[PDB]
Every structure is written in structure tokens, then in C-alpha cells.
Amino acid sequence: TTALVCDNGSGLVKAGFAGDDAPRAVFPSIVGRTLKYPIEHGIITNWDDMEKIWHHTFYNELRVAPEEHPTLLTEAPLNPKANREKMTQIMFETFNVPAMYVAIQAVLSLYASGRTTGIVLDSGDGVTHNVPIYEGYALPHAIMRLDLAGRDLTDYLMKILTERGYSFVTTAEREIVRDIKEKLCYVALDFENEMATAASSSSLEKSYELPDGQVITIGNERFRCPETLFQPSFIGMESAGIHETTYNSIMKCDIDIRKDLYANNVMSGGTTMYPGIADRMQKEITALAPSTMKIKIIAPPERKYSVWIGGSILASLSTFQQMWITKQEYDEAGPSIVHRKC
Amino acid sequence: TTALVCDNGSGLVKAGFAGDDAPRAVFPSIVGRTLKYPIEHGIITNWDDMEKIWHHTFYNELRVAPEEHPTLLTEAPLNPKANREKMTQIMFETFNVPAMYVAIQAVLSLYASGRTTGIVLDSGDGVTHNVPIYEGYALPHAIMRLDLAGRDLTDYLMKILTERGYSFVTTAEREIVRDIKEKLCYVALDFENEMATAASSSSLEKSYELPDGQVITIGNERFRCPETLFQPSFIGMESAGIHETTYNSIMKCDIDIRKDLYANNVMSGGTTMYPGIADRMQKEITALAPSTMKIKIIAPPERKYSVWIGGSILASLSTFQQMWITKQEYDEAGPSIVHRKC
Ligand SMILES: Nc1ncnc2c1ncn2[C@@H]1O[C@H](COP(=O)(O)OP(=O)(O)NP(=O)(O)O)[C@@H](O)[C@H]1O
Ligand SMILES: Nc1ncnc2c1ncn2[C@@H]1O[C@H](COP(=O)(O)OP(=O)(O)NP(=O)(O)O)[C@@H](O)[C@H]1O
Numbered sequence A, B: 001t002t003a004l005v006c007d008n009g010s011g012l013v014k015a016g017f018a019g020d021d022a023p024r025a026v027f028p029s030i031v032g033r034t035l036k037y038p039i040e041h042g043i044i045t046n047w048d049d050m051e052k053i054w055h056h057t058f059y060n061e062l063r064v065a066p067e068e069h070p071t072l073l074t075e076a077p078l079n080p081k082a083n084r085e086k087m088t089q090i091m092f093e094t095f096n097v098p099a100m101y102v103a104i105q106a107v108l109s110l111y112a113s114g115r116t117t118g119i120v121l122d123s124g125d126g127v128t129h130n131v132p133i134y135e136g137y138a139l140p141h142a143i144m145r146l147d148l149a150g151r152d153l154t155d156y157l158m159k160i161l162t163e164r165g166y167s168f169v170t171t172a173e174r175e176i177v178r179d180i181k182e183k184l185c186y187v188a189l190d191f192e193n194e195m196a197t198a199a200s201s202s203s204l205e206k207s208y209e210l211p212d213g214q215v216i217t218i219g220n221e222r223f224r225c226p227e228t229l230f231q232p233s234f235i236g237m238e239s240a241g242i243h244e245t246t247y248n249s250i251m252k253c254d255i256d257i258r259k260d261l262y263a264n265n266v267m268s269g270g271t272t273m274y275p276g277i278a279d280r281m282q283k284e285i286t287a288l289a290p291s292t293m294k295i296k297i298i299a300p301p302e303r304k305y306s307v308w309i310g311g312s313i314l315a316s317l318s319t320f321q322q323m324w325i326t327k328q329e330y331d332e333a334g335p336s337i338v339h340r341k342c
């Protein structure tokens, strides 16, 4: 009688029960044979492996029988119709869930901010999306996708620390650098100024303690790493930055709702957790938009879990109860019911 | 009967004869006891040493008897009255010149561009000035001085190459790095973009051959070095950059002539020889000025020698012949004649 909420990400699975303020279980989306990531850039690409992960969610992490709880899952924006159907098939026929639904992650994040209209920036471990949303529906022609997120940043941080004399190379060491990224990296309001402070003084330098007790210093790397979000060619990508893509996204929208989009930039996901990221987005967006445009960036403290929380909220909504797909419905109709409904 | 033109700089002496398109002699402003630079930041600070240099100019470089040629000398903008008088005293009483004059360097550069009104940027080896000029006279309340020029850049280039694995440390090696600076450095139109090209590809890398035959590669250093002109805090200076100081200089001027200043940015001196420096000044000045402002940067090809050439031109002008101070005048009046005249 309690709904489950399962948020499948490229790097982390967020799972728990609808009606809770936070997921009870957060764990890595990996299977080992060497580690495989069954979710690449927000999309499921190995189904056997994904089954093992959902099997782990039910029986190990949450400790519930799947056939007893309606289950709300999440999908990346622009997730192919065929992918969504396979997900539905696995849930009802492998796991015997009594009901389910598949929600778009970035919309859930918007709901968690107490909003139904806005433009979300959702940046995770494997993909970055700009998702314009009007009255609860994502506008698919205007969604932007950037294949650059936290894992790319971490690798970049491994590369640039190497040029300071450190040798971070192994996949175990990649975990240590992810940790440094999360404790020590921030977004410079102005990249040049920051490089010049760091060139001429030690005021931005931080110490980090390694597992074995050794202490190292990191400098301009702190902000050079997440700077790649605004200038992706730092790792050889031609794409525009997250500021430009927010702008391009808003511009693919009907002029009537663009003011509301600009006033409602919601940030979502672990890779939007960099201190200073909101002030830099404000400043960058300002520079591209018309002079009179009211620009607002909302960055909730709990935005590592926004998608999950939006799910918890939706699953609990009286209005949403009519939208669950029941096993009866599915076994009667066919995997198509996941259109004229979801 | 031929006038001499002697342009005394922090690093190089430019000397020759009025009526010529170029100085016949260019040589370093040094005395050795260890090398001393008798001119610090454009100002003469050792007089015995300066006498040796002028003695070298007359007898070794130019091969003329001083008592036979009117001699035009140059001074930094804002050169103290007392300094100018000592110069005059040495010329007439140590060297027995039959006539002389002391001209402001940055005005000469303006004249060499065929102009009497404009704002000069004069950047040498030891000092950088912004000099607003209206109808032939420098406006002293509006002159900006920056203690950052080519020698500072070269040292900075020695420091940053060291962090790439090279060890440029000795004063002999400092000459090699000055040479690299002059053959290989340029000004990025956009610093960030350039850092990102250089981080992700080898397309800005250049080879340089050392005297002993070894070949080295230099990368982002090419534009990181002269970038210090626009962002001086890269070497721990709080001053504004050459773009900001041009702006601040123009703003200390009467509103009536500011349009003419903006339309007439003349660049002068070796440190304005960086490829791309004119486009970057255009762009930076544009960003600070009002939207409607006609901005123009004039960068003559011969601007390493503009000061000298302006001197050659002035010394040859029929209008200027009344302005020479003769030895007769001086021996009659006193070193003050260098006001109600010069
Ligand atoms: N404080 C922090 N600062 C910067 N990055 C962080 C921080 N905390 C977590 N992250 C990054 O957030 C990423 C995972 O966040 P999450 O929003 O769960 O992505 P996900 O859903 O697994 N991947 P995606 O499929 O791209 O949505 C990892 O790369 C983390 O390193
Ligand atoms: N192609 C070039 N690119 C960059 N810098 C250059 C180039 N050629 C010469 N320079 C620099 O120009 C400086 C000397 O130029 P110059 O205009 O003669 O200065 P100066 O009069 O001796 N010094 P100052 O007293 O500051 O005017 C040296 O630092 C050179 O390295």
C-alpha cells in the first residue's frame, strides 16, 4: 500500500518510499563481472544488468516484495519510446509490480521546487539536460542535451592534477579525485580574475588528506575543473556551455512563456552542487539575455535528491492516482498503454 | 648643421640624425661595473652612468662631435622638472652642445602618426603610459602610469616556463626568453577560449631553437605572458590593465575632446608589438565605452621606433626651429629657461 520511488541515474540509484523527505537508499549503478555502468548518459543500455540493479533495489536495499508496492520509475528527457516500453515490460512481467509509472526526471525536480512551469538544468554524473517545462509538460523540441557531467569533470580533474606532479590514474584513485571534486571544487565568478589570484598568491590553495594519511595541495584546479561546464572545449568538446544551452533552449520556446522560463531557472543534480554556480549562471545568462529580462536561478540545498523528492511528491498526489498503470490494464492492453497515459 | 635625435629608454637607446626615417644606432642602456640600468621606469636615476651612455652615443655609436650638432633628447611623461634641468646642464656644460631641447616621448609618437590630437599608449621595457594629447600638448592631470612593461613580461615568461619543466634562471637566459617573447608571444582575443584550445589540442604550440641547437615547445605561455598587460594581478600588481587605464585617462579629460581621444588611440613602443594587441584593445575598449562611441586603434608597423621618428620629424620642422635652446641663451639665463620654452 506504500508506493516505491526509484530514480535510476548514470552513476547513482536513489530509492525509497513515496511520502518521505529523502530516499532511504542511495547506491552506485554498477554491475561487476571490471565494472559495467548499465546506464550510459541517462539511458539504460544493458537490460540484464539493469534487472540485477532493480533486483538489488527491491530485495537488498529496500527489503520489500515488488508485487506489493506501486512503483514509480524515472527516465531521462527524450528517452526513446522503445526504452520506456521495455522498462514497463520488465517491471510487470519480471518483477510482478501491481502498478507503475515512468516519470521524466527533470519535471520531478521542478515539482520539488514547488513549480509546474520553469526551465530545469539537470546535471548528473553522465549527462546534462536543459528542460523547459510549461504547466507540467516538458517541451521536447526545446530540450537540450549535453554529454558532459560529473564523471567527465572528475577525469578532467585527474588529468590536470597530473600536470601539477600528482599521478591519479587507477579507477580506485578516480574515486579519491571525485571526492576532492566534491569537497574542494567551486565555480569562479570570473575565470581570468581567479587564474590571476592563483598565479600570484596562495589564497585559493586547499589541503586534502588522502586515505593513507598524506596531505596534498590543490590550487586553480578547484575552479578549472567545473569551468568546463561553461567552456566545454577544455576537454575537446565543441558544444556550447550550460549558460548558452539554457539560452538556446529558452529561444526554441514560444515567446509567450520565455519571461517565465528566464524567471524560473531551477538547478538539479549533483553536478549543480558547486559553490558559486548560481551566481555565475545569473551573470552569464544576464550577459546573453535582453537588458530588461528578470533573471532568476533557484538552487535548492537538497538538489542532489530533487528528482527523487519530486517523485515522492508526485506519487503521493491525489491527482496522480488515476495515472498509475495497473498490472490488470497492462495484461489486457499491451505495452502501448504507455502513451495515451504516461 | 645636422641635428641629432637621441631617445633614451629604460632598456634601449635609439639614436640618429633628424631627417632620417630610422635611427642609425640602437643599443642597450647599460653600464657594467654586474649590469646597471641607469634609467628606471623611464626616468634617469644615475647621472654619472647616464653621462657614459651619452658619451657612447656621440663618440662610439654616432661618431660625431657634440659641439657641432643641435641635440634633441626625450623624456618620459611626468618627468620631474629637476630631472629635465640636470639633463640640460649636462648637455651644455659637459658635452658643449650648441643647442638642444627635451621632448615628451609619447607626443613624438603621436606626431609620427601624422596627428597632433590623440591618446597614446606607450609601452616600453620599463614603463607604460597613457598620454592624452590635444593640439600638441600632453594633458598632465590625465596621464596614467603603469610600472609594467617588457622586462616584467619577460621575467613572468621565465617564471611560467619553469612550471612547464624548463629552467630559465640566469641573466644570459633572460635574454633568450626575451627573444622567445618577441618571436612567439601574441595577445589572445579571448583568454578563456585560448586556454581551452591549448588545453585540448596542440594547435597553438610552437618550437623554438636555443643557441646550442636544442629545440623546445612553448604553448599557452605565448599568450599568457602578454595577457598580464590587461590583467596585471597575474604578477601581483593591483593596478588596472592597459584597456582600463586608457578609459580612466580619457575620463579625466574635458568631455569636448573625449570623442577625438577614443577615435585616436595610437600605440607606441616594443611592448605594443604583440600580434593581436590592436583587436584586443578594440574589443576591451568597446566593452567599457558608451554604445555609440567610434573607437579606433592605430598601430603603425614602425612603432618600436615611433618616438625616435617623431623626433626626427620635429627636429626638421621649420616651426620648431625657434624652440631650440642655444648655449648662448643658457649661459645667459640659467636652467630655468627650460620652462617658459620647453
Ligand atoms: N558537492 C558536489 N559537488 C560537485 N559534484 C557533486 C557533489 N556531490 C555529488 N556530485 C556529483 O554528482 C554526480 C552524481 O549526481 P546525480 O545527480 O545522482 O547523477 P546521476 O543521476 O547518477 N547521473 P545522470 O544519469 O547524469 O543524471 C557525481 O558525478 C558526483 O561526483
Ligand atoms: N616583437 C616584439 N614583441 C613584444 N615585445 C617586444 C618586441 N620587440 C621588442 N619588444 C620589447 O620592447 C622593449 C623595449 O622597447 P622600447 O620601446 O625601446 O622600450 P624602452 O624605451 O627601452 N623602455 P621604456 O623606458 O619603458 O620606454 C623590450 O622589453 C622588448 O622585449
Ligand SMILES: C/C1=C/C(=O)O[C@@H]2C[C@@H](CC[C@H](C)/C=C\C=C\CC1)O[C@@](O)([C@@H]1CSC(=O)N1)C2
Pocket: A011, A012, A027, A028, A029, A030, A035, A125, A150, A151, A152, A154, A171, A174, A175, A178
Ligand atoms: C560516494 C559515491 C558517489 C558516487 O557518485 O559514485 C558513483 C558510482 C561510482 C561507482 C564506482 C565505484 C568504484 C563504486 C563505488 C561507490 C561508492 C559510491 C561513491 O562511480 C562514480 O564515482 C563515477 C566514477 S568517478 C565519478 O565522478 N563518477 C559515481
Ligand SMILES: C/C1=C/C(=O)O[C@@H]2C[C@@H](CC[C@H](C)/C=C\C=C\CC1)O[C@@](O)([C@@H]1CSC(=O)N1)C2
Pocket: B011, B012, B027, B028, B029, B030, B035, B125, B150, B151, B152, B154, B171, B174, B175, B178
Ligand atoms: C636585441 C636586444 C633588445 C633589448 O631590448 O635589450 C634591452 C637591454 C638588455 C641589456 C642586457 C643585455 C644582457 C645586454 C645586451 C643586449 C643586446 C640588445 C638586446 O636587457 C633587456 O633585454 C632587458 C632584460 S630582459 C628584457 O625583456 N629587457 C632589454
Ligand SMILES: C[N+](C)(C)CCCS(=O)(=O)O
Pocket: A186, A187, A188, A189, A203, A204, A275, A276
Ligand atoms: C564565493 N565562492 C565560493 C564562489 C568563491 C570563494 C573561493 S573559496 O571557497 O574561498 O576558496
Ligand SMILES: C[N+](C)(C)CCCS(=O)(=O)O
Pocket: B186, B187, B188, B189, B203, B204, B275, B276
Ligand atoms: C590572430 N592572432 C595572431 C591574434 C592569433 C593567432 C594565433 S597563432 O599565431 O596562429 O598561433
Ligand SMILES: [Ca+2]
Pocket: A008, A009, A010, A105, A124, A269, A307
Ligand atoms: Ca539523474
Ligand SMILES: [Ca+2]
Pocket: A231, A232, A233, A237, A238, A239, B196
Ligand atoms: Ca568552446
Ligand SMILES: [Ca+2]
Pocket: B008, B009, B010, B105, B124, B269, B307
Ligand atoms: Ca621609450
Ligand SMILES: [Ca+2]
Pocket: A196, B231, B232, B233, B237, B238, B239
Ligand atoms: Ca587585477
